[PDB]
């Protein structure tokens, strides 16, 4: 059943899954036409598909071509998620293939199980945690090969860097989900905290900058109250 | 006009004949239904006034053979048999009808109800669903499970409704994944119509007798088969004309026929309010919407 705090540990287990998150597969600006009426221009999009305990990324490029002549967008979205995932799937040797995969969002339940129905030993999962995997955006590098893509591209990253050679699986996501919750929350704020010191840099081969230990306690402290001030703000408390 | 006799009544019983019902006392002089119209299939039902659990009955037609029933003592119901005799039949039920200790099938002239509920029910479908074929007869009860509950346990007592399942590769195409979930015309008029029922007729014939099965015997699982096989043409954006004219017709003789009172376990609200509201066909059922609205607003 559903993934939540009580069955938490269960993404650091040895059991290979895949979190799923479709937010930023359809991806649309909204503008005035001559005429004064409103329309959408697409924009590239992403499948942000995660291993919480490798940190591996499979972000697949949604590239705005595959919008072109088709009705129903967002509900062609959620199919179009379900096709290249269940693509990816079968793209991985039999022992890489996940046990189960997790959708952030419940409306890719039945898309994904229509798609996986080959696979019926793959348990599909939803979630009670409110997982901030729509900043994933937010990340400079990812956004910058999604606006880049001419073409459909999968591309493989480390959403930990090297995180794993000195924390455990636990403490990288933990880690992940507050980087992404501070960008989500007030995306200006966290970027500054992230970048202020010039010294501190990102290797051509990483996402985040090459905090010590220390500075990643400072670091992590910072956007803690980032998200708690942004939320006094937000409802008056 | 045919008739199935009693040996006797020796416990109290609601019995029932297709749409009609009689209290019987225990060793009540009771010995049988008469005037039993030719043409159709018939279902004669049972609740035990000491055990309102088991509802349980009979699938017959007269025109296959001379039946009756036969309390056993022993395994505790009303038993259905087959009299080889034709003399010792047409002997038997000429007595009884002298004596008048028969009811007679209480149909009114005008009303085509039974018709309604069963016009493409054949015997010889109820056998295949339903398996003893040392009787040409068909015992259903209200604990009865279908081949498909038994996959998600005893083969030999089960329901053997032909199996639909919306999330499985019998009903999705690979490469036409969305396409097949969202319009499951395919799934209806390939995989089900030419694929397994072979015909409108044989698939209509299944869903008339799954509504009854849940109907007489609060058959779980024939109540789940009733509204798949609705929500699979409901669904379905290319159906032919004369399936949706037949499929309106049945579905309002069966809202009609159901007690007001069971609106709530034998009606599945998800169900109905997608077929007549969201469904492809959301638009082609004017007298099953008309009666729905009328008779179980709340369900909508």
Same mark, same amino acid.
């Given at each position: ?57 499979? $972000?697949?490029? !949604? ?24 693509? $990816? ?28 129905? /080959? ?19 937010? *990340? ?18 480390? *959403? ?22 501070? $960008? ?9 905290? $992230? ?23 400072? !670091?992590?402290?910072?956007?803690? /109250? ?12 | ?48 006034? %000491? ?9 017959? %037609?007269?025109? &296959? ?9 022993? %395994? ?25 200790? &028969? ?19 054949? &015997? ?123 499929? %309106? ?52």
């Amino acid at each position: 059943g559903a993934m939540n705090s009580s069955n938490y540990a269960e993404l650091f287990n040895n059991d290979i899954k895949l979190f799923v998150d479709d937010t930023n597969v359809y991806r649309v600006t909204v503008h005035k036409t001559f005429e004064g009426n409103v329309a959408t221009k697409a924009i590239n999009g992403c499948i942000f598909t995660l291993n919480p305990k490798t940190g591996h990324l499979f $972000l697949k490029i !949604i590239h705005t071509s595959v919008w072109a002549g088709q009705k129903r967008l967002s509900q062609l979205a959620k199919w179009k998620t379900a096709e290249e995932v269940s693509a $990816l799937v079968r793209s991985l040797p039999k022992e890489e293939q996940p046990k189960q995969i997790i959708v952030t969002r419940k409306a890719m339940l039945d898309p994904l199980e229509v798609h996986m129905l /080959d696979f019926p030993n793959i348990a599909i999962r939803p979630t009670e945690l409110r997982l901030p995997f729509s900043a994933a955006m937010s *990340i400079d590098k990812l956004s910058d090969v999604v606006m880049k893509a001419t073409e459909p591209q999968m591309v493989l990253f480390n *959403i930990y860097d090297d995180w794993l050679d000195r924390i455990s699986s636990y403490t990288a996501f933990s880690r992940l989900t507050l980087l992404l919750r501070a $960008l989500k929350t007030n995306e200006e704020s966290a970027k500054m905290i $992230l970048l202020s010191d010039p010294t501190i840099t990102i290797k051509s081969y990483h996402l985040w900058p090459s905090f010590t230990d220390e500075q990643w306690i400072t !670091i992590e402290s910072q956007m803690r /109250d980032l998200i708690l001030t942004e939320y006094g703000r937000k409802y008056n408390v | 006009m045919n008739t199935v006799p009693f040996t006797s009544a020796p416990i109290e019983v609601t019995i029932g004949i297709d749409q009609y019902s009689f209290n019987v006392k225990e060793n009540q002089p009771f010995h049988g239904i008469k005037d039993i119209p030719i043409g159709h299939v018939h279902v004669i039902h049972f609740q035990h006034a %000491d055990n309102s659990s088991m509802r349980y009955g009979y699938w017959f %037609d007269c025109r &296959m053979g001379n039946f009756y029933i036969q309390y056993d003592p022993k %395994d505790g119901l009303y038993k259905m048999m087959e009299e080889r005799d034709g003399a010792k039949f047409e002997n038997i039920v000429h007595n009884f009808k002298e004596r008048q200790m &028969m009811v007679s099938y209480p149909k009114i002239d005008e009303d085509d109800t039974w018709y309604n509920l069963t016009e493409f029910v054949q &015997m010889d479908k109820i056998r295949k669903i339903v398996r003893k074929d040392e009787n040409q007869f068909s015992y259903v009860d209200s604990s009865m499970t279908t081949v498909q509950e038994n996959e998600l346990s005893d083969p030999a007592h089960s329901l053997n409704y032909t199996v639909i399942n919306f999330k499985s590769r019998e009903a999705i195409r690979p490469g036409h994944e969305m396409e097949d979930f969202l319009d499951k015309s395919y799934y209806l008029n390939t995989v089900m119509l030419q694929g397994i029922f072979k015909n409108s007729s044989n698939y209509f014939g299944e869903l008339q007798f799954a509504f009854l099965n849940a109907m007489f015997f609060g058959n779980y699982g024939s109540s789940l088969q009733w509204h798949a096989m609705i929500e699979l043409i409901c669904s379905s954006a290319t159906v032919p004309k004369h399936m949706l004219d037949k499929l %309106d017709e049945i579905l309002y003789y069966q809202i009609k026929t159901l007690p007001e009172q069971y609106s709530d376990i034998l009606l599945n609200e998800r169900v109905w309010n997608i077929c007549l509201y969201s469904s492809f066909q959301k638009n082609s059922l004017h007298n099953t919407e008309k009666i729905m609205e009328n008779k179980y607003p709340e369900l909508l």
